[PDB]
Amino acid sequence: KQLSSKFGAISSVLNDILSRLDPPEAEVQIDRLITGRLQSLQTYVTQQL
């Protein structure tokens, strides 16, 4: 369910962000999305452990 989370970005779709915004703002939005997904993955790994 965490894949459908905006994480402070414009949208939660990888190809949709890169096709409309300029590369710098898209870089920040993708960076925020990936670090949010990495934090969620680390939390899931800790819970599973």
Partner: protein, 50 residues
């Protein structure tokens, strides 16, 4: 940056580790009749690689 420049003439990558130097020169290359030697590219088929 998106616009007439940095999208068809000289696009700069997201990481650069450097900067530019800009200063005013209105007498060395600017003339009363219009210096037409400097020109830009307006139309391109697609975007430009950095």
């Amino acid at each position: 940056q998106t616009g007439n420049i940095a999208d068809y003439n000289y696009k700069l990558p997201d990481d650069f580790t450097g900067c530019v130097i800009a200063w005013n020169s209105n007498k060395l290359d600017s003339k009363v009749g219009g210096n037409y030697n400097y020109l830009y590219r307006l139309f391109r088929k697609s975007n430009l690689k950095p």
